[PDB]
């Protein structure tokens with residue numbers, strides 16, 4: 055309400071368009087020894103310190119979850135995107151590409167991302183179950199599908215009568231306080247009777263659900279060709295912030311789409327299984343945009359997502375991919391995204407192979 | 412004093428501290444019945460604590476029933492809707508010069524919107540605070556203050 | 565049209581996603597001929613994004 | 615095996631960077647087969 059000037063918080067200011075290329079002037083270059091963060095190349099220890107795990111569900115206490123179309127991710131220093139070699143005779147040959155950052159994820163495996171949960175959403179990493187207290191809420195996994203066919207599961211550990219979880223997929227723009235299907239960008243199942251919920255509309259084109267159901271979830275979206283028919287460029291936003299005691303990265307998320315025309319992604323579908331037994335097709339009409347597996351809680355619902363290598367009734371398809379596979383695929387993809395952005399800003403020129411892949 | 416103890420004291424004394432009478436501001440409004448000191452708890456805007464996403468569905472509902480919306484934003488996530496269920500705080504007029512001010516407190520995990528006194532309020536005074544209503548395109552104000560914005564918005 | 569765009573724009577408006585995915589699969593498979601494996605991958609799959 | 619970023623930096627990133635330079639400079643009509651040819655013929659200096 056003042057002017058096109060300094061950011062809304064004096065805690066950290068990013069370089070405005072008039073202060074272009076202003077890197078986040080957060081912590082000073084003068085660091086303390088510390089000792090705990092003095093890991094070297096000879097030691098074998100994961101620098102991403104996961105919090106203490108507790109059998110009772112807990113809350114991430116100092117994480118400002120996504121809002122206003124503003125995505126929030128973990129940050130690590132990464133003082134140099136590694137390009138160190140011998141001192142070449144030409145002192146103007148190589149570029150260090152000092153991004154001084156990375157999207158390192160606080161996860162041993164592809165799990166339910168804590169960055170995209172509601173403040174009323176509790177997790178227990180003993181089974182990575184998710185639970186709530188009042189009404190409905192939504193959580194999502196770490197990964198997100200953009201093409202191909204894949205598959206995961208949800209295991210339900212507690213379903214009292216006043217406890218009805220919902221399980222399915224949701225694109226970004228999905229308000230994580232809504233019950234996973236209240237908008238047109240989410241398609242789920244209600245875990246009282248198998249009922250497909252989308253646009254808050256319930257449809258009985260489905261089988262029946264059981265209290266101890268280990269439910270399999272198969273979903274096939276077309277390649278990014280039929281998804282976009284154009285450039286699927288991924289120019290990323292990256293902003294450095296130093297929240298109360300830790301460094302984090304902000305990126306710009308998508309905006310609420312007013313899409314009211316139906317253009318289904320070609321040959322995309324969703325299939326639901328009960329313990330591998332085909333519960334049937336859920337949604338053939340699938341809108342564009344990346345999707346991610348999501349779970350909605352009612353009052354005190356206990357469910358958990360699960361990947362493929364520890365499966366119970368897996369499909370024997372050679373094309374579908376477990377949660378972990380697409381997870382590390384997207385992780386490596388965002389690594390290359392950081393690489394390319396630091397290249398763009400740091401070294402003149404860019405170049406990519408024969409487009410098709 | 413502890414916010415819980417102060418809140419218990421406020422909920423004990425609220426029924427006999429304030430009243431509602433015919434108001435020269437507009438219609439009926441909240442008047443002071445016993446001299447209220449500055450910063451002390453005047454009144455809770457008690458009502459139905461709801462989440463924000465359910466506001467519109469309620470509002471349109473009232474819009475379908477012709478019943479006025481009595482909602483105050485607790486925060487970006489919660490709202491006290493007093494349209495159907497509330498207390499006397501639904502009769503606090505506004506003044507550009509308020510002797511009161513709204514603040515959100517946390518008691519045992521639940522948030523309460525309490526109007527406290529900006530100054531030492533004396534008996535008979537009509538209670539008014541800053542609604543801080545965003546600028547629309549216009550509600551004339553008759554608070555009587557010399558600094559009156561002529562409009563809440 | 566395409567050649568009048570700046571560096572960031574044109575190089576973005578042409579080719580980014582294949583690097584996004586191919587460098588990923590190259591790091592995933594860890595081939596002995598990284599540049600040559602990328603070359604084989606691209607000469608097989610030249611067409612279907614264009 | 616090196617981590618993702620380090621492996622790609624030690625294996626493909628420099629020849630990639632020189633291809634970046636040449637693509638940004640000459641602006642060919644079909645950059646697809648341009649980098650095809652480039653990554654095929656200029657691989658010997660970074661194998």
Ligand SMILES: Nc1ncnc2c1ncn2[C@@H]1O[C@H](CSCC[C@H](N)C(=O)O)[C@@H](O)[C@H]1O
Nearest residue numbers: 436437438439440504505550551552553554
């Ligand atoms: N300062 C002010 N200036 C103009 N209108 C005011 C006002 N304060 C209150 N009002 C009007 O009074 C209404 C309060 S709702 C209460 C209705 C009525 N006063 C009654 O006691 O039954 C509002 O809708 C608003 O339009």
Ligand SMILES: Nc1ncnc2c1ncn2[C@@H]1O[C@H](CSCC[C@H](N)C(=O)O)[C@@H](O)[C@H]1O
Nearest residue numbers: 439440501502503504505550551552553563
């Ligand atoms: N300065 C102002 N101008 C117009 N309306 C006002 C006002 N201050 C308070 N109001 C009224 O206050 C209401 C919201 S809270 C209601 C309190 C009001 N004293 C009452 O007796 O009901 C609105 O409907 C509005 O009509």
Ligand SMILES: [Zn+2]
Nearest residue numbers: 505506507554
């Ligand atoms: Zn006023």
Ligand SMILES: [Zn+2]
Nearest residue numbers: 506507554559
């Ligand atoms: Zn006024």
